[PDB]
Amino acid sequence: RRNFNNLTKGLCTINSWHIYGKDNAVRIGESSDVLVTREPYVSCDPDECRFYALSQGTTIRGKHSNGTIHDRSQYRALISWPLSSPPTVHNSRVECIGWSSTSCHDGKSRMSICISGPNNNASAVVWYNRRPVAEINTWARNILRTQESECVCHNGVCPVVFTDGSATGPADTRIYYFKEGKILKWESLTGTAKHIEECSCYGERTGITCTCRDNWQGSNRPVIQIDPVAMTHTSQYICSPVLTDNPRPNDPNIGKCNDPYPGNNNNGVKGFSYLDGANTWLGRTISTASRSGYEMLKVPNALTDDRSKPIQGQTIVLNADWSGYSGSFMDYWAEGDCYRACFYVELIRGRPKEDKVWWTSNSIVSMCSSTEFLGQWNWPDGAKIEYFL
Amino acid sequence: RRNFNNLTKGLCTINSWHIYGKDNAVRIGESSDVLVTREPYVSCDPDECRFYALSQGTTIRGKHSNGTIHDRSQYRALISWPLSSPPTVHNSRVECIGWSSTSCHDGKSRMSICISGPNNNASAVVWYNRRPVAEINTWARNILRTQESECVCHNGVCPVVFTDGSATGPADTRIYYFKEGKILKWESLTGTAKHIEECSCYGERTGITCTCRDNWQGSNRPVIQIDPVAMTHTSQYICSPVLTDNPRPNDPNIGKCNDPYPGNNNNGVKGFSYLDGANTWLGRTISTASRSGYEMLKVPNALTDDRSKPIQGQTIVLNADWSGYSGSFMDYWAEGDCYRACFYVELIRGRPKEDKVWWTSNSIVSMCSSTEFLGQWNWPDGAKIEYFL
Amino acid sequence: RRNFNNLTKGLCTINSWHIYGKDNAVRIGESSDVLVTREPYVSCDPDECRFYALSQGTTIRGKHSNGTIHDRSQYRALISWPLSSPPTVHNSRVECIGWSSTSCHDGKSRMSICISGPNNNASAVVWYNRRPVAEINTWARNILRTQESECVCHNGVCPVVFTDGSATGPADTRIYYFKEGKILKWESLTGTAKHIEECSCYGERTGITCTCRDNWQGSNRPVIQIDPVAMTHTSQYICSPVLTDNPRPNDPNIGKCNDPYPGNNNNGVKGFSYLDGANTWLGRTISTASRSGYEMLKVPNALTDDRSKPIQGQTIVLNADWSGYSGSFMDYWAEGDCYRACFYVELIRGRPKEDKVWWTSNSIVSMCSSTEFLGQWNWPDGAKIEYFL
Amino acid sequence: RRNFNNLTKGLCTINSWHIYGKDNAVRIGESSDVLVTREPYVSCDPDECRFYALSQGTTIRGKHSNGTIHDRSQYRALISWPLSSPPTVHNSRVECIGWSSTSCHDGKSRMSICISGPNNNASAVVWYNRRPVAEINTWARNILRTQESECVCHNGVCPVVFTDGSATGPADTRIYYFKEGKILKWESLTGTAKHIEECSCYGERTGITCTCRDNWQGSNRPVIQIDPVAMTHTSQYICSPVLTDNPRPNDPNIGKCNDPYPGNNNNGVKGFSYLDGANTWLGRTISTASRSGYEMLKVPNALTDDRSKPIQGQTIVLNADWSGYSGSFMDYWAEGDCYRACFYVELIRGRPKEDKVWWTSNSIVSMCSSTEFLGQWNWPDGAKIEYFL
């Protein structure tokens, strides 16, 4: 009875951001069976929106939380759970097993992809309506990996960005196009982006826009623009001198559109943007050195204007508080004439920055745009680490 | 397929009150993952009635329960859960994030409103069928706030009372009218009520009646009467000398219809009444000094008769036991020829009255009316505070 | 779309009993949030069968389990939960608040009745499809009380037996007839039963048969036979000298049809029978002194034959193990040409017999009949009380 | 509306195995209410696939976990729970009570069978759509027992293999044929298999193939081939010299088709195979001495070729890690032109191999086939036993 969703609207005008969801997972997990997670995101079905993350296969208070700084193990899985609840043993639904993921609903059913394996022999399994449908073996034998936030579909076609290869040099990035979990096509990355990790994507009538992480030489973010009908793409960098990776140099007065802006090598953080002419907003950590704080900045024409600077902003997380990965999502099934931009911020607690505990986990905060100019709060994780000692 | 509910019945004749629900949350939370809450209420959908409250983002036994006397933080959310279960991490569904709320079902879907932010920059987000639809910024920059119990709808129009401004002097109260989460209209408070907080509302064929709290000078309660078709209102006070705020003076022989009855300033408690001629019943704490005990009193024509006194009553909570906020709700979808009046009482435990623990929480008891003259019990929270030490 | 169920079948031939459900609640509750209960039963809906009991408003490991030998408090409620799971905070659905109950499904919706109040002022609230519909005040001001197992309906009419008055002398027993929760009729007890408590009922094409407890002078069980169409009844005792109350005298050779068989006063236990000519089976504790063991005995024509003795049996619980209340239920919606007799046994743990713990709780075992002659096991609670010390 | 499923497809070509599900139950159960289990399996409904196992009626951290090496007690039950979650008190649905089981969906509803009783008087109860339908008494009075993994249905007919009698000599094996839980037929075992335990079955257009355990003299596995239309069967052994029981001799160069391959008596392990000409894959423990490691081996024509050796393989569990029972299942309702072979491995932890704890439990890993040649990982339980001390 359901039809595939088509991307037929533009973005709503973003004049501020309002609270959407928050799970307080570390606070609650001090005294409840909350799973250790990282790499969270949010994704909507036609009738519900849910939180997602990679479990570590242990609760926070469990003794197996010791060592959860590590990224890849056989005990990780993509889980989903109700919006603004914390991920518990009892409410977390496993989507698939592995240590790197994406997921999206096409209007009829959900596709979830999880990668598992050793570093030199990893494979993706593509699930559609809760069944495995297709599998993809590593092509570069060096940590096949994907977005860590939601994909986006148009008329049943759901593109997904993957990378396999070095994190500190040229790698082999591919864009796959799925329909009902089946591989329609893949293509190698083209354009001027020089390194791609952890793309954060959203869709609108123009196409699908992904803002990624250059882990090699860049502190400006690469952008992949996908046409899901033709199944083709382009890439470049955000031209603006408002640099949005982390760590990063200080903001210059001229950015770089077709190459990495230099100064910080071999590191980064997953992040996102909404690139929409005069309605452009960029997210970034407040700190240039570490994953602390989070702000949204209105930077007109950031994608294309190598002199562009902010004209409005909003603090999301104070610089005194830990942040983490961030990514885009939207509720494509909400009624109205425009798609309301949304995002989440991962609020990382524990190692490496808080090493009196032996675990690493996170909570989630998420916001959506308003056409009002709303007052701002700040949204910390809220747990007192000393309680875990 | 569903239609908006219309208020087409009068109240049933209230000859006594019968037990409806009770969650025993503090008893159970001594040994289970029960969330710390306050400001509870009850609200019905066409097929289910649920408990609601503002979580504090921690369980009672969790170490983060320390400090939960505080009213506003980033860790609060409106939650709902099944009738007479306690609010646990596992059964509590988040309706929205914030520290002041209302919620109601219009017959088709539920509207929930949560306010969040710092005191000088708060904002309401209006959710409808589990999606954000509208946002309202603070207009007086001083703790924008709302009912803390259910709203009521007629033909899709759901009025809600908000206040922004001082709690100890004139403030800016507005009545908003929503349909499908969209703002149809708002108006400033009119009439003779001099201060409005925390309105408790119910609907019937005559219109929507809200009984509120005058926190400034009054120990009689203000009343707002709303016509949800014309989208207009009036206000006054309950005229009766049976005073129903807390703390309060002793009952005189002449009440006040159009001004606060004096003697207690800068305090109050959320409460309620059913104002229906000879079928009028008022709730109040038994104590005139503190939030202890709870009784219902049949006070004919209390709204309009400044000499009216009780002719019948029922003890709900003994004066030896702690009470708290109270509010009205009804199951507008129950079959029959009349709407059965219902209410809840918040049973506050912990601080400030029980300061050997470091938390503040509550449980819920709720009653509905009977046309029988039923025997009365009393309904304490039932937890032994010493067990938490 | 659903129709009321009609009692159109006879009982299946009972040649043995097979295991139906068992929750292991005390074993599991040693280390999980299992509610303290007593007075359990089983009842079916058209699409599911569930366990029921009266919660005590605390978990077993919780400190509020101390004192749960007591029968009546404001913290009790009728709960239901999935067959063979234990009653936990998370899976227990509250049907209504109180300390004596019954419940049954009529084919369209479920009626649940809970009595609450002080001993001299108790009241029943009748819920239908999860809403309160009717209320009944105490008529004798002495612990209004009901079946503690399921009722039975025919063409929408659901009879329920209540008692109010002394437990150690003549009392005021009434049979109420409900439809959609509304009172159609009530009548005073007639016939030769001299005292009635805690009736256990089942239905078949002949009518509704209830086996009760004479707490005053009898150790034979009273029987109430109800015609749910005419809404009339008769009463007598089981004539057989196989005595089935507890405590009780030893079995004589002549029973009593119209008066209590003497020797034990002012005590008893809830129990049951299936009275069906040559297909008659009686349940009883094995011990004549205490609530220990449980057996089923095939006693042809027990109702009417004052010389009848057993011709077959089955041990359910060894005499070395604690038992408790027992009662009848059937899955009236199972396909086939006959109704399969079922029963449960409450396996009481803790006080008064095991007083090294400070609580009283139970688990459940339940059996249904087979037309095979199946091998027998025995079914203890299975918890080691020493683990709770 | 639903129709019975018909076995109309062949197996997909198996070129490797991909991860399907993993529950990490022992890791999570270190700090959560995870039930002690053993004898797990997986089985699909038309709209969901679930994990199954025999509970021990206690959590792992509960004190009643002491003694759970024992196989048969009144506290065991067949439970099911969501794929890749662990079996908790809160998510485990009881299918039936007992200590040996099978279960399968016929396309319309699920049949579950549980055996309970003492060793000399056990009985099976056959449940269909969650109601008991048929019962089978022991025929040899010596531990009536069944598959411990899913059955398979065709056009509503679901065969199930049972054994009653000695585990160390000739026994009485029967194949029962059920439809809607009713016994259509049973027959005694025929063919050249000399002892049958714990059959693991799958279906395809050819019929139903079961790979079993010869506990008496054989270290090759018996095979039962069932025609579910004619309701007849044959039996033999896997002819290949790649021996797949445990413990077992080393692989010779000539296997045995019609008799046990000798060297190890009175022991074995439940296991499985997919027997499909050149697409044949066998599972086995890596160790020849103990239940450690697990591998899949491609052995062309293993069923019929007494010289056949492996031509491809995949490690599932390293020899350094504990394994356990293994069995077959498939998602018969997945779209496509072939049935994708799947299996699970029970990862046993605790006694007897790890006797510093007093319990025995397990977790689950499960895989399905791919037509790609995917990289391999290994999939241990992942718990650190020292944490439980």
Ligand SMILES: *[C@@H]1O[C@H](CO)[C@@H](O[C@@H]2O[C@H](CO)[C@@H](O[C@@H]3O[C@H](CO[C@H]4O[C@H](CO[C@H]5O[C@H](CO)[C@@H](O)[C@H](O)[C@@H]5O)[C@@H](O)[C@H](O[C@H]5O[C@H](CO)[C@@H](O)[C@H](O)[C@@H]5O[C@H]5O[C@H](CO)[C@@H](O)[C@H](O)[C@@H]5O)[C@@H]4O)[C@@H](O)[C@H](O[C@H]4O[C@H](CO)[C@@H](O)[C@H](O)[C@@H]4O[C@H]4O[C@H](CO)[C@@H](O)[C@H](O)[C@@H]4O[C@H]4O[C@H](CO)[C@@H](O)[C@H](O)[C@@H]4O)[C@@H]3O)[C@H](O)[C@H]2NC(C)=O)[C@H](O)[C@H]1NC(C)=O
């Ligand atoms: C209640 O809640 C509300 C709502 O949230 C809150 O108001 C909000 O306050 C915040 C904080 O003040 C504000 O965010 C800031 O916005 C700044 C941009 O706005 C200002 O500049 C624009 C542009 O000016 C240029 O261009 C104009 C033409 O376009 C030209 O005319 C100018 O002359 C100039 O050339 C200007 O237009 C703005 O003026 C409007 O807004 C004012 C209010 O902000 C108002 O008073 C004015 O009248 C005017 O009003 C109109 O517009 C508003 C909407 O904007 C409408 O609502 C009105 O109706 C009118 O139409 C402002 O003057 C932005 O620059 C800020 O970001 C910088 O600073 C923050 C710290 O605060 C950093 O974290 C940022 O990263 C950033 O600074 C870094 O980056 C830049 C870029 O490279 C560098 O230059 C900096 O040096 C700095 O770099 C360093 O740090 C970074 C990070 O660590 C590092 O990476 C670097 O390497 C380096 O180390 C900030 O985002 C927000 O917009 C505002 N919202 C609203 C709606 O008002 C209230 O305060 C709350 N109330 C209370 C009591 O609390």
Ligand SMILES: *[C@@H]1O[C@H](CO)[C@@H](O[C@@H]2O[C@H](CO)[C@@H](O[C@@H]3O[C@H](CO[C@H]4O[C@H](CO[C@H]5O[C@H](CO)[C@@H](O)[C@H](O)[C@@H]5O)[C@@H](O)[C@H](O[C@H]5O[C@H](CO)[C@@H](O)[C@H](O)[C@@H]5O[C@H]5O[C@H](CO)[C@@H](O)[C@H](O)[C@@H]5O)[C@@H]4O)[C@@H](O)[C@H](O[C@H]4O[C@H](CO)[C@@H](O)[C@H](O)[C@@H]4O[C@H]4O[C@H](CO)[C@@H](O)[C@H](O)[C@@H]4O[C@H]4O[C@H](CO)[C@@H](O)[C@H](O)[C@@H]4O)[C@@H]3O)[C@H](O)[C@H]2NC(C)=O)[C@H](O)[C@H]1NC(C)=O
């Ligand atoms: C089993 O369970 C049942 C059911 O619950 C229970 O019965 C219930 O008992 C309670 C407690 O007794 C009872 O509640 C009280 O009701 C009082 C009102 O009823 C009495 O007065 C009326 C009115 O009399 C005037 O008006 C008449 C004309 O309208 C006139 O004729 C009179 O002469 C007089 O002028 C009177 O009509 C009543 O009489 C009927 O009811 C009697 C039973 O109550 C019965 O015996 C009579 O025959 C007659 O029966 C008819 O009516 C009933 C229904 O009412 C029908 O069922 C019958 O069939 C007949 O038709 C009564 O004489 C009410 O005043 C009480 O409230 C005051 O007291 C409580 C403490 O008890 C306080 O907490 C209250 O706040 C309140 O007192 C404060 O406030 C007032 C007002 O300002 C002050 O004047 C006081 O001084 C006091 O103020 C102080 O304290 C407050 C609070 O701290 C503070 O704020 C102040 O500042 C100050 O410090 C109370 O509500 C209930 O109605 C009754 N229900 C039923 C159905 O009977 C049984 O007892 C239980 N059984 C057992 C064994 O336990």
Ligand SMILES: *[C@@H]1O[C@H](CO)[C@@H](O[C@@H]2O[C@H](CO)[C@@H](O[C@@H]3O[C@H](CO[C@H]4O[C@H](CO[C@H]5O[C@H](CO)[C@@H](O)[C@H](O)[C@@H]5O)[C@@H](O)[C@H](O[C@H]5O[C@H](CO)[C@@H](O)[C@H](O)[C@@H]5O[C@H]5O[C@H](CO)[C@@H](O)[C@H](O)[C@@H]5O)[C@@H]4O)[C@@H](O)[C@H](O[C@H]4O[C@H](CO)[C@@H](O)[C@H](O)[C@@H]4O[C@H]4O[C@H](CO)[C@@H](O)[C@H](O)[C@@H]4O[C@H]4O[C@H](CO)[C@@H](O)[C@H](O)[C@@H]4O)[C@@H]3O)[C@H](O)[C@H]2NC(C)=O)[C@H](O)[C@H]1NC(C)=O
């Ligand atoms: C595997 O699992 C199976 C299945 O469960 C199991 O077999 C089962 O074993 C149990 C235990 O032995 C058995 O239960 C007992 O059944 C007794 C009744 O059966 C016997 O008597 C009848 C009637 O005999 C009279 O009437 C006949 C005509 O009707 C007449 O011909 C006789 O001469 C006589 O006058 C008799 O017909 C039976 O014979 C049949 O069954 C035999 C097997 O039991 C078989 O060998 C025979 O060949 C014959 O077979 C036919 O019938 C069976 C079905 O029954 C069919 O299956 C066959 O195909 C044939 O058609 C038996 O001889 C019953 O009396 C027992 O109950 C008393 O004893 C128990 C203790 O065991 C007490 O707890 C009870 O309360 C009760 O005793 C108390 O009460 C009585 C009554 O007042 C007093 O007289 C007593 O003194 C005593 O009172 C004291 O204690 C109480 C309680 O504390 C106290 O309250 C008092 O005050 C006082 O202090 C018992 O129920 C069961 O039926 C049987 N089932 C089957 C299907 O066989 C196997 O053993 C298991 N295998 C293994 C290896 O474990």
Ligand SMILES: *[C@@H]1O[C@H](CO)[C@@H](O[C@@H]2O[C@H](CO)[C@@H](O[C@@H]3O[C@H](CO[C@H]4O[C@H](CO[C@H]5O[C@H](CO)[C@@H](O)[C@H](O)[C@@H]5O)[C@@H](O)[C@H](O[C@H]5O[C@H](CO)[C@@H](O)[C@H](O)[C@@H]5O[C@H]5O[C@H](CO)[C@@H](O)[C@H](O)[C@@H]5O)[C@@H]4O)[C@@H](O)[C@H](O[C@H]4O[C@H](CO)[C@@H](O)[C@H](O)[C@@H]4O[C@H]4O[C@H](CO)[C@@H](O)[C@H](O)[C@@H]4O[C@H]4O[C@H](CO)[C@@H](O)[C@H](O)[C@@H]4O)[C@@H]3O)[C@H](O)[C@H]2NC(C)=O)[C@H](O)[C@H]1NC(C)=O
């Ligand atoms: C990334 O991930 C991939 C994917 O998993 C992984 O590659 C995989 O590696 C594993 C491990 O190496 C490999 O599994 C092994 O497979 C062995 C079989 O393959 C080899 O033999 C065949 C058959 O050769 C005979 O027959 C031919 C004709 O049929 C003839 O031409 C020959 O001359 C010969 O007569 C041969 O065809 C294979 O060659 C192909 O594959 C090679 C790669 O494996 C490739 O290099 C070749 O070019 C050729 O490629 C073609 O085929 C592949 C698919 O196979 C296609 O993908 C290509 O495109 C080409 O078309 C191989 O030479 C199998 O024997 C192994 O099992 C034995 O050893 C393991 C230990 O490793 C034991 O645990 C097993 O039990 C077993 O050994 C026991 O049992 C046997 C049988 O009785 C005894 O003889 C042994 O002595 C031993 O017995 C002892 O132990 C047991 C157990 O304890 C005990 O019970 C006994 O009693 C006794 O004590 C093993 O299964 C897997 O297939 C391979 N997969 C793929 C797709 O390549 C990569 O390594 C990973 N990468 C990294 C970097 O990690």
Ligand SMILES: *[C@@H]1O[C@H](CO)[C@@H](O)[C@H](O)[C@H]1NC(C)=O
């Ligand atoms: C388990 O039970 C045995 C008795 O059989 C006892 O010796 C042992 O101490 C128990 N283990 C624990 C951890 O209590």
Ligand SMILES: [Ca+2]
């Ligand atoms: Ca970078």
Ligand SMILES: [Ca+2]
């Ligand atoms: Ca006041």
Ligand SMILES: [Ca+2]
């Ligand atoms: Ca008695």
Ligand SMILES: [Ca+2]
């Ligand atoms: Ca063997």
